[PDB]
């Protein structure tokens, strides 16, 4: 049997890097090597496998399981269809990377505009992302495997024939689909939990009518919060009714709202899926963390870790498979801090399972109550983790903290109907 955790890295960690978060993969892998991995090493380990090859060469045919073929064909040749925008680029070769292309009218049909402007290398970064997630899904389906971790994937906004929010191919959907065909036909329900600060609209649209994939998204929601969808009334369609869950949060929400509500929704989702549940895929963005410039929430590292600990614990008990993906996140150090403690939790949990234990997190500090964990001084990027140099440290809040739902909140009202039909039945 292989090590129960596969950490999908690849040989060029910049392959999937995007122009706005170009350095982020480096912070994440650095934090994994110096915070999460050592305690389970002796690199060699019986807990995790550091995957660096082979990455399948993927093309249009490995993405048609979800995406419209004309859309994919266009992405795969778009860099041949116009010149680099040299007015937009004040720094010239050899000191530039991934520059914007000049737009063409055909970009409009496929949403390749604004934040999804095409750039040189875009098809290669799409290939790296999809390839990594497909490899992670295939390794996860092997026996003896508890989890596969691809911090570089998780482009949850892409739709069947539209790009959006920096996502072109939806490797979440493609990863769920590849997992789906490789799991036993007796047990292959999938729960996908999306704790990125933005509505997982691509993923939800791919499974709106499906009752074998339950999509649960936590996200900020409000006027001028991207992408605009994800209200409490989106509950699915047809056979899929009841298998789409949204937890839309007020801008600035803290752990006391987000964590409480996600715990409540996750337990509902476990129930709606019952014993057919086989795998959980976690889309773990770090832009919900307080201080993020684009996410408009105020979660703590400990709060995000807490949500994910509930999913890991349930997967360990019932012997499920876990596919962990990254997503958004626009502070490099917050992204690596979060990736570090979530990964250490996954390893600690898998190590506990192989020893027969029922206490899963004994090797990984709980940042919700331990505010003294230091960033490893061996981190290459260590000097960036100030002023605290602690694993829970976050930049000052960009939006005011909210601890109570606003007056009139439809989230509260939906609780209200149910939350009093509870105390009534218990009487
Ligand atoms: O990270 C993401 C995507 C974030 C994003 C992409 C494009 C535009 C905006 C984005 O966020 C915004 C907030 C306010 C106004 C505009 C935007 N998805 O997971
Ligand atoms: K989300
Ligand atoms: K669904
Ligand atoms: Zn996001």
Q: How many whole angstroms from 287 Cα to the centroid of ligand 1?
A: 10
Q: How many whole angstroms from 165 Cα to the centroid of ligand 1?
A: 6
Number of H helices, E strands in the chain: 9, 8
**99: buried, middle or exposed (CB in 10 Å: 19+, 13-18, 0-12)?**
middle
Determine the residue of 164, 226, 228, 331 to mutate for testing ligand 1's pocket, defined as the one with the most ligand atoms within 8 A of the Cβ atom: 226
The tokens for 270 are 């476990």
In terms of Cα–Cα distance, which of 389, 356, 364, 355 is closest to 375?
389
Task: Give the domain ranges of the chain.
Answer: 5-384
State the Cα angle at 418 between 270 and 222, rounded to 5°.
85
Q: 3-class SS at 214? A: strand
169-200 burial, b if ≥16 CB within 10 A, otherwise e?
bbbbbbbbbbbbeebeeeebbbbbbbbbbbbb
Going by the DSSP 8-state scheme, the letter that residue 11 receives in this structure is S
Which sign does the torsion angle of CA 348, 350, 355, 359 carry?
positive
Atom of ligand 1 nearest to the CA of 328: 1
Alpha carbon 229 to its chain's center? 18
Beta strands in 94-164 (DSSP E): 147-150
Ligand index nearest the alpha carbon of residue 227: 1
**368: buried, middle or exposed (CB in 10 Å: 19+, 13-18, 0-12)?**
middle
Q: How many whole angstroms from 301 Cα to the centroid of ligand 3?
A: 28
Listing from the earlier edge strand, what are the strands of the sheet with 277-283? 48-51, 5-8, 147-150, 321-325, 277-283, 189-194, 213-220, 244-249
Atom of ligand 1 nearest to the CA of 287: 1
171 within 8 A of 155, measured Cβ to Cβ: yes
Is residue 157 part of the annotated active site? The answer reads yes
What torsion do the CA atoms of 323, 135, 330, 196 make, to the nearest 10 degrees? -30
State the Cα angle at 284 between 349 and 37, rounded to 5°.
40
161 within 8 A of 68, measured Cβ to Cβ: yes
Q: Ramachandran region of residue 249, left (φ > 0), alpha (ψ -120 to 50) or beta?
A: beta
Determine the residue of 294, 295, 326 to mutate for testing ligand 1's pocket, defined as the one with the most ligand atoms within 8 A of the Cβ atom: 294
282 within 8 A of 304, measured Cβ to Cβ: no
| Pairwise CA distance, residues 185 & 189, whole Å | 9
Ligand index nearest the alpha carbon of residue 207: 3
Q: How many whole angstroms from 246 Cα to the centroid of ligand 2?
A: 8
CB atoms within 10 A of CB 271: 8
CB atoms within 10 A of CB 18: 18
| Pairwise CA distance, residues 128 & 115, whole Å | 20
User: What is the residue-wise DSSP string for 330-380?
Assistant: --HHHHHHHHHHHHHHHHHHHHHHHTT-S---TTS--TTT-TTPBPPTT-T
Instruction: Please give all residues whose CB falls under 5 A of ion ligand 2, grouped by chain where several chains appear.
Output: 194, 196, 200, 217, 219
| Pairwise CA distance, residues 52 & 134, whole Å | 14
| Pairwise CA distance, residues 330 & 221, whole Å | 19
Going by the DSSP 8-state scheme, the letter that residue 34 receives in this structure is I
Q: Which helix (H) or strand (E) element contains residue 271?
A: helix 255-273
Match 């292309």 to its residue by tokens: 101
Q: Pick the catalytic residue: 157, 198, 219, 221?
A: 157
Closest residue (by CA) to atom 7 of ligand 1?
Answer: 165
Beta bridge partners of 189: 277
CATH class given for the domain over 5-384? alpha beta
Q: How many whole angstroms from 242 Cα to the centroid of ligand 3?
A: 8
Q: How many whole angstroms from 87 Cα to the centroid of ligand 2?
A: 36
Beta strands in 72-212 (DSSP E): 147-150, 189-194
Closest residue (by CA) to atom 17 of ligand 1?
Answer: 226
CB atoms within 10 A of CB 101: 21
Rg (CA), the chain: 21
Beta bridge partners of 215: 192, 244
**70: buried, middle or exposed (CB in 10 Å: 19+, 13-18, 0-12)?**
exposed
**212: buried, middle or exposed (CB in 10 Å: 19+, 13-18, 0-12)?**
middle
412 within 8 A of 405, measured Cβ to Cβ: yes
Determine the residue of 198, 202, 219, 292 to mutate for testing ligand 1's pocket, defined as the one with the most ligand atoms within 8 A of the Cβ atom: 198
Q: Which phi and psi angles does 150 have, rounded to 5°?
A: -125, 90
Q: How was this structure determined?
A: X-ray
| Pairwise CA distance, residues 355 & 347, whole Å | 13
Closest residue (by CA) to atom 3 of ligand 1?
Answer: 165
Closest residue (by CA) to atom 19 of ligand 1?
Answer: 328
183 within 8 A of 141, measured Cβ to Cβ: yes
The tokens for 212 are 């074998």
- The residues lining ligand 1, judged by C-beta closer than 6 Å to any ligand atom, are 115, 157, 165-166, 196, 198, 226, 285, 287, 294, 327-328
Peptide bond into 54 cis (omega under 30): yes
């Amino acid at each position: 049997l292989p090590p129960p955790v596969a950490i999908i890295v690849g040989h060029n960690i910049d392959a999937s890097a995007m122009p706005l978060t170009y350095e982020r993969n480096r912070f994440v892998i650095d934090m994994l090597q110096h915070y999460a991995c050592p305690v389970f090493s002796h690199v060699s380990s019986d807990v995790f496998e550091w995957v660096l090859e082979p990455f399948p060469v993927v093309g249009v045919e490995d993405m048609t399981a979800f995406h419209d073929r004309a859309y994919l064909n266009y992405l795969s040749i778009r860099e041949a269809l116009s010149e680099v925008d040299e007015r937009a680029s004040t720094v010239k070769p050899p000191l530039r990377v991934l520059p914007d292309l000049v737009p063409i009218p055909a970009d409009e049909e496929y949403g390749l505009v604004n934040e999804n402007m095409p750039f040189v290398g875009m098809w290669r970064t799409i290939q790296a992302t999809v390839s990594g997630t497909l490899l992670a899904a295939r390794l996860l389906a092997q026996p003896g495997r508890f989890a596969a971790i691809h911090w570089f994937g998780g482009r949850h906004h892409a739709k069947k024939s539209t790009a959006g929010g920096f996502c072109f191919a939806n490797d979440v959907v493609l990863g769920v689909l590849e997992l789906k065909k490789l799991l036993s036909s007796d047990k292959n329900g999938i729960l996908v939990v999306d704790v990125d600060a933005h509505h997982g609209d691509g993923t939800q649209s791919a499974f709106l009518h499906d009752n074998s994939v339950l999509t649960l998204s936590m996200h900020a929601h409000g006027v001028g919060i991207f992408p605009g969808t994800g209200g409490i009334e989106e509950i699915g369609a047809g056979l899929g009714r009841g298998f789409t869950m949204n937890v839309p949060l007020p801008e600035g929400a803290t752990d006391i709202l987000a964590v409480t509500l996600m715990y409540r929704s996750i337990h509902f989702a476990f129930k709606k899926l019952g014993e057919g549940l086989a795998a959980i895929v976690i889309v773990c963005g770090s832009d919900a963390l307080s201080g993020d410039p684009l996410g408009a929430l105020n979660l703590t590292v400990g709060g995000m870790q807490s949500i994910i600990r509930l999913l890991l614990k349930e997967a360990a008990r019932r012997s499920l498979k876990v596919l962990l993906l990254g997503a958004g996140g626009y502070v490099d150090t917050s992204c690596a801090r979060l990736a570090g403690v979530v990964t250490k939790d996954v390893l600690s949990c898998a190590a506990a399972m192989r020893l027969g234990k029922t206490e899963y997190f004994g090797d990984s500090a709980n940042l919700g109550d331990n505010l003294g964990v230091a960033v490893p001084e061996g981190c290459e990027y260590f000097t960036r983790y100030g002023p605290s140099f602690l694993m829970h440290g976050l930049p000052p809040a960009r939006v005011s903290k909210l601890y109570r739902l606003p007056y009139g909140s439809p989230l509260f009202m939906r609780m209200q109907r149910a939350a009093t039909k509870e105390a009534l039945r218990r009487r």
